[PDB]
């Protein structure tokens, strides 16, 4: 649906 990822989703 297009959600923004959390701060640590790309750590």
């Amino acid at each position: 649906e297009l959600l923004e990822l959390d701060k640590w989703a790309s750590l």
Partner: antibody
Amino acid sequence: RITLKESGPPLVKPTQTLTLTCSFSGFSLSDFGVGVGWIRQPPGKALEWLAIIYSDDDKRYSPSLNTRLTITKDTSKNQVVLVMTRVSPVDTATYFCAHRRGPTTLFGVPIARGPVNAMDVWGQGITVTISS
Amino acid sequence: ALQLTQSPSSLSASVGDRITITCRASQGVTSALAWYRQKPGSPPQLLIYDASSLESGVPSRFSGSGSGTEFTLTISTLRPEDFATYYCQQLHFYPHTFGGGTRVDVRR
């Protein structure tokens, strides 16, 4: 030991601005990856996420509330403030602030992000009623 | 946005029972999910973090499993202080969604 505590006015009138304060101890908003968030709960209802702020000053807000919310921290006083403008009766709820761990580090190097997936310590909560 | 549905919404049980609660997400949230117990008049208390990690100080009768879109919480042996409301929280996407909760009361 980590402890948070919410303070503010128990009563506010519709159209008014509600300012809430989360005073904590046991951690710093200068500590790596640490966050402090706000969650609310209308009486007899479910938890509803409002916002979060991190020690690097990164901020996020609930999309259905972002035109009325402002979150700010005061690193030196160990506080986080939440401002909600133009409140109405649906805003009456118990407001909670909570701590979010930052990533685990080993010799100043993030090695585990698992502990960030939760709000681990909560304040007791403050009850706010909105009535004219 | 993301939907976080708990099942069941209500549940009756007795001391000693093994109960399971579930939380489904409308989209994959990886392992970024937390479980909390909330007794009336108190703030939610963390039980499980990152879908299956047992939070320190929390009794071993609490366990969490699953990833992606299906999560479950199980309390192997219900104690009296477990009669309460449970919540699940997603932290993979902003906003950090909470489930609707499932109430656990005394069966009669």
